[PDB]
Amino acid sequence: MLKIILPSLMLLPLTWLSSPKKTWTNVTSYSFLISLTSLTLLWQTDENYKNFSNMFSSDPLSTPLIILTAWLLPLMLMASQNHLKKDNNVLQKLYISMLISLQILLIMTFSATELIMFYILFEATLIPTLIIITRWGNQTERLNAGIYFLFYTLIGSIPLLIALILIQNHVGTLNLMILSFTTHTLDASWSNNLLWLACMMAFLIKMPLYGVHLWLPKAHVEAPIAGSMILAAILLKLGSYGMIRISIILDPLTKYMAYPFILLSLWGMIMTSSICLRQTDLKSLIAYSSVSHMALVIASIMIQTPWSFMGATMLMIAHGLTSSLLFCLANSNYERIHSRTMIMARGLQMVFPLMATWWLMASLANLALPPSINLMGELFITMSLFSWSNFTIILMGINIIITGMYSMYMIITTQRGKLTNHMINLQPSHTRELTLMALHMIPLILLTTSPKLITGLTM
């Protein structure tokens, strides 16, 4: 997998060497094709994993993501052509390159055989992200948000560093292939009960768990649209990908060491879903929607039943695409409105007829409408959770009712009701804004036709 990567690196030379006026089209047009080369990995004609080479591999779980990581770079660069079009021609070429490095790094992290290669690349992605959030962040508080995003991930990260070096000494190689075909069975000691927490905690932090998710609402609030898309679509899912590949070892402990997180997540799912119900900042509501719909995932990567896992793989890819779509349209309202407040800007369909159709489809993806991969995902996690304990439906049942309420409230108070009297007149929709959306949903429609590709390792 060096075509999904080397051609990517070369994007950096192109963003720099290219003309200031033509820099945007060379980069966006080329990475669209970079995504097309990424699609070749999907050609798996047998169940064996495609080990491209010693360090680089792609199995069913990584492949559905590498393609998404390559896909969003085009979109990210199309959603940030407006803001970042007021810059000095060298601030742009920095932002474009920053976005380019994220998927170079993220493509490799999702396509990495050695778990510590994951760690080095895993924690590197913070550098590009923190720059995108802090350097271009509009609000006074991004310095703070950046600190929260760096420390919560970093304090979790050093325990994983110690744990992975620890298993290398215990087993003798951090190669995901071998670690899988070798006998690593923890022994339920008090210490192992700590190892397990060391490995999972760093992944559980960037996958916002109810206890440590305050970093994500603060980060996406002041982050520029491209950073918020990256955090929701690819960055948070880095934590999920890690939990799937790391729990191959630590096989016995999670049977009983998971209860704490599972309950934290399911109760967390309800409270995070509910506070979405009365949050005035739209970007705030989407972020907590992201916490709740990701709290379902940590509760399926821990129950560990075949269906959970691919419920997880289905939902992660699906929610990634949906969340960005929501964060992308939130930005289009923010740029014309100039405020994140949900109460202002009422009645837009009256003035932006189509964006409202995109808003409606994004919300229906947000809630579980049935001919969507989003629902298949939740339906499956719901099933397994029920298997874990029939009572789980109650808590995963209060979340579904709340999820319907906030998803439609975003449509009802932003895209319906009487028009706002006279905010700065709202200029019509650009074709870029609409495509950036179409590019998010057309793939959501196509993937829903053949869900098999994003089903995970389990199935």
Partner 1 sequence: DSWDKDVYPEPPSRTPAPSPQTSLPNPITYLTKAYDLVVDWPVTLVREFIERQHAKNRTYYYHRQYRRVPDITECKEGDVLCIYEAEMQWRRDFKVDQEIMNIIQERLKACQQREGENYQQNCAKELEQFTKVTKAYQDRYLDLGAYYSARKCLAKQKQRMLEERKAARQEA
Partner 2 sequence: ARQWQPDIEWAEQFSGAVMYPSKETAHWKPPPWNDVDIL
Partner 3 sequence: DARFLRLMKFYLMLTGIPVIIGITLVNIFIGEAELAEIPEGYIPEHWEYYKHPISRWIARNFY
Question: CB of residue 308 vs partner 1: minimum separation in angstroms?
Answer: 7
Using the rule CB under 6 A, is 244 a contact of ligand 3PE? no
Interacting residues with partner 3 between 406 and 445 (CB under 8 A): 428-429, 431, 434-435, 438
The stretches of 236-339 forming alpha helices (DSSP H) are: 236-246, 254-257, 259-277, 282-295, 306-337
Q: What single string gives the DSSP state of each residue in 193-204?
A: HHHHHHHHHHHH
Q: Which residue reads 């096989």 in tokens?
A: 251
x-or-dash pattern for partner 1, window 233-252, by CB under 8 A? --------------xx--x-
Of the pair 252, 397, the CB lying nearest partner 1 is at 252
Q: 15: which residues sit within 8 A by CB, 6+ positions away?
A: 23, 26, 27, 93, 96, 97, 100
CB 423 within 8 A of CB 349: no
Q: Can you tell me the distance from the alpha carbon of 269 to that of 396, in angstroms, rounded to the nearest whole number?
A: 8
Using the rule CB under 8 A, is 352 a contact of partner 3? yes
For partner 1, the binding residue among 181, 418, 428, 431 (CB under 8 A) is 181
x-or-dash pattern for partner 3, window 30-49, by CB under 8 A? ----------x--x-x----
Name the 3-class secondary structure at 245: helix
Closest-CA residue to 402 (of 231, 279, 302): 279
Using the rule CB under 8 A, is 82 a contact of partner 3? no
For partner 3, the binding residue among 13, 211, 260, 353 (CB under 8 A) is 353
Query: How much of the chain is in helix, strand and coil states, percent to nearest 5?
Result: 70, 0, 30
- Provide the token pair at 343: 């109460």
47 binds, among partner 2, ligand 3PE, partner 1, none (CB under 5 to 8 A by kind): partner 1
Using the rule CB under 6 A, is 58 a contact of ligand 3PE? no
Interacting residues with partner 1 between 395 and 414 (CB under 8 A): none
* Cα distance from N-terminal residue to C-terminal residue, the chain: 23
Using the rule CB under 8 A, is 51 a contact of partner 3? no
Q: Can you tell me the distance from the alpha carbon of 230 to that of 226, in angstroms, rounded to the nearest whole number?
A: 6
Can you give the binding site for ligand 3PE, defined by CB under 6 A? 35, 39, 42, 64, 67-68, 71, 147-148, 151-152, 155-156, 159, 162-163, 166, 191, 194-195, 197-198, 201, 212, 317, 361, 364-365, 369, 371-372, 391, 394, 398, 401-402, 405, 443-450, 453-454
Q: Which residues are near partner 1 by CB under 8 A?
A: 47-48, 177-178, 180-183, 247-248, 251, 304-306, 308-309, 457-458
The binding site for partner 2 (CB under 8 A) comprises: 86, 136-140, 338
